[PDB]
Design a protein around this ligand. Structure first.
Ligand SMILES: Cc1ccccc1Oc1cc(N2C(=O)CC(C(F)(F)F)=NC2=O)c2ccccc2c1Cl
Ligand SMILES: Cc1ccccc1Oc1cc(N2C(=O)CC(C(F)(F)F)=NC2=O)c2ccccc2c1Cl
Ligand SMILES: *Cc1c(COP(=O)(O)O)cnc(C)c1O
Ligand SMILES: [Mg+2]
Ligand SMILES: [Mg+2]
Lengths: 363, 364
């Protein structure tokens, strides 16, 4: 496996102009440098390279292009109020990427060495980490089969690469723009016995049609429904949280359980940790159905619904389109107090306004 | 709109590769001299199609095909006939499935007849690669990828359609039936209701490499894909599944899982159902089949034959299934296999021009 100490660094000779962080479309702007590491079954891992952002030269038979032999990660670097650049629980992203590689039959790698190569890449491109407490640098580790063979088989050739892409505030305002969700049980993101709990590329290609349908019906995101009971699972790419009075008349923060169809998000685990620590209401990893939700709405038992994930720390939901009717969620009329408290706490940690075990200052 | 075959730009190779031995071909490892490429953008639509020397693709590392599996493929064969005429077999069915897959993937649509004509011109230029052997063929791999330089999860605004050619030998190097052992583990599910299992989208396959490694680790050649609480038998690896048996009503029946969203509508599957209907010798049912249906039938000596069918292996007899830690024998090879043999003879006769058919086209 490759070592950070073997890094070959070829710096760019011409640096690009940085974007205005308030005029950023997510994932369209890339920094000056990338990380690449070649693997073959014959010779193993090559030395890792930090070099100028470049096209990949791939055999057209590359299994990544034919059988989605590919996975990715997503994590952020934050420029702190103290001007220290922090990662946020990056070891968890390395753990999930390694597990996904095993599931994909891509070759395994030393997680500590990859994280150190990523830190060296971000350090070289550190002026791309935005000077704004509502912006960040998105880190995209990517892992593709480059086997020049149409056989459906474990690849004997692979490329691990990392891209950097600055992201502005999810909300152009700076604060909350609630989303309308499209809930059509016709589409299923992930199933029991599937790969829904991994960031394998194949989990996402199947979802574009549902998102186009959402947009066609004036919604911003898909509400992913599962099973005959229409369980509510994920808000687009984000974990789903419901703050309500439950069936027992108890104040409760509820989120679907990790049963294999849910991506175990970093922010999801943090929010559960915070909600347990505060001890002010019940915290349940439990199934939630559309019928649970509409019954609760009829009883004025719903306070807040929000997504949480890498894309958006906290994304309030105002409406769900379901069985041809618009269902209003009163999140924005209830503060949103919990959503606001969670956003404040996580951004305070991310931007170093308070100490945390959850952050690491860049190498 | 669409690219047009009449706009084809042909850049011939000046240096040609040595043709491989038709008796010594490993699937998908040898590529011909030329490829087809067609660029698309939302801004300007389809660019002119190019036949040029086989080359690496130059892709932005942000290309959505690499991140979100914004990709699909097809698989079809050209056959050098006993009369030395090169034939395609039901290629319009592959064009129909590719168009439908593009729509489901949010990739741009194209004219199926224009693509088929571009494919014919590519095969014609590389026609000496169509093996001189009645057990070998030229595999045609149309591929369609998002090349959008953006990490946003979105309909692509940039795409590439390309076609590779690769000669392939007999599925069984001997040239005869070698029955397969199947690994049936309900822990893995290939496809779900509301998924893309009925399309050739790349994302359907990436999940399956791990399961095949497990099959091989337990001495099996293929995965038997199980679905649902009742353990429905769906597909034999990348192949459609056929069961020739006496059903619960005591009737001779050819059964195959129905197209309810989790089954690829194979070209071979379509041909076999067409033949079985045409012959009118037994009941033909698209119906659910569970492991319990199968083991009940085996206990009653009601099973005659089980086989996979797909472009890979026209007819692949099944001898055994490993399920709940026991090896379950299927008596396919003790019953001829008569139906499997009849189907193999019919389809290979048509493919190699030993008989005329509506199902074949002689190359442009
Ligand atoms: C390529 C493809 C992709 C998706 C659907 C069908 C396809 O067509 C195949 C698949 C093959 N295949 C494997 O590549 C591996 C495989 C394993 F044993 F690993 F399961 N089984 C197989 O049949 C083939 C094997 C030998 C000759 C032809 C094959 C064709 Cl044409
Ligand atoms: C990229 C990714 C893939 C898988 C999981 C998380 C990911 O991270 C995202 C995803 C985004 N995203 C879309 O790109 C499209 C999208 C739609 F509306 F189309 F569904 N929703 C989204 O959240 C983001 C949108 C804006 C700013 C950041 C995003 C991040 Cl960091
Ligand atoms: C391609 C494929 C088949 C076989 O279909 P044909 O068109 O007959 O080759 C069967 N199952 C799956 C999953 C496939 O991808
Ligand atoms: Mg080590
Ligand atoms: Mg029984």
């Amino acid at each position: 496996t490759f070592k950070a100490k073997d890094l070959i660094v070829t710096p760019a000779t011409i640096l690009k102009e940085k974007p205005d962080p308030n005029n950023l479309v997510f994932g369209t702007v890339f920094t000056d440098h990338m990380l690449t590491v070649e693997w073959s079954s014959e010779f193993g891992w090559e030395k890792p390279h930090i070099k100028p952002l470049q096209n990949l030269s791939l055999h057209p038979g590359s299994s990544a292009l034919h059988y989605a032999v590919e996975l990715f990660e997503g994590l952020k670097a934050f420029r702190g109020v103290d001007n220290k650049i922090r990662l946020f629980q990056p070891n968890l992203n390395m753990d999930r990427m390694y597990r996904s590689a095993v599931r994909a039959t891509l070759p395994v790698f030393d997680k500590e060495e990859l994280l150190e190569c990523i830190q060296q890449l971000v350090k070289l491109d550190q002026e791309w980490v935005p000077y704004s407490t509502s912006a960040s640098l998105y880190i995209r580790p990517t892992f593709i089969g480059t086997e020049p063979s149409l056989g459906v088989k474990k690849p004997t050739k692979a490329l691990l690469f990392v891209l950097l892409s600055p992201v502005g505030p999810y909300f152009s305002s700076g604060t909350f723009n609630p989303v309308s969700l499209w809930a059509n049980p016709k589409y299923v993101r992930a199933w029991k016995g599937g790969t829904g709990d991994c960031k394998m590329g194949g989990n996402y290609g199947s979802s574009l049609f549902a998102q186009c349908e959402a947009v066609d019906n004036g919604c911003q995101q898909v509400l992913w429904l599962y099973g005959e009971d229409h369980q509510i699972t994920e808000v687009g790419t984000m974990n789903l949280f419901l703050y309500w009075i439950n069936e027992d008349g108890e104040e409760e923060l509820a989120t679907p359980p990790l049963d294999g169809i849910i991506l175990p998000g970093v922010t999801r685990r943090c929010i559960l940790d915070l909600a347990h620590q505060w001890g002010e209401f019940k915290v349940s990893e439990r199934y939630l159905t559309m019928d649970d939700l509409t019954t609760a709405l009829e009883g004025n038992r719903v306070r807040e619904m929000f997504g949480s994930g890498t894309a958006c720390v906290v994304c309030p939901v105002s409406d769900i389109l379901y069985k041809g009717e618009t269902i209003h969620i009163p999140t924005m009329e209830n503060g949103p107090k919990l959503a606001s408290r969670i956003l404040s706490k996580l951004t305070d940690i991310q931007y170093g306004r308070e100490e945390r075990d959850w952050t690491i200052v860049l190498s």
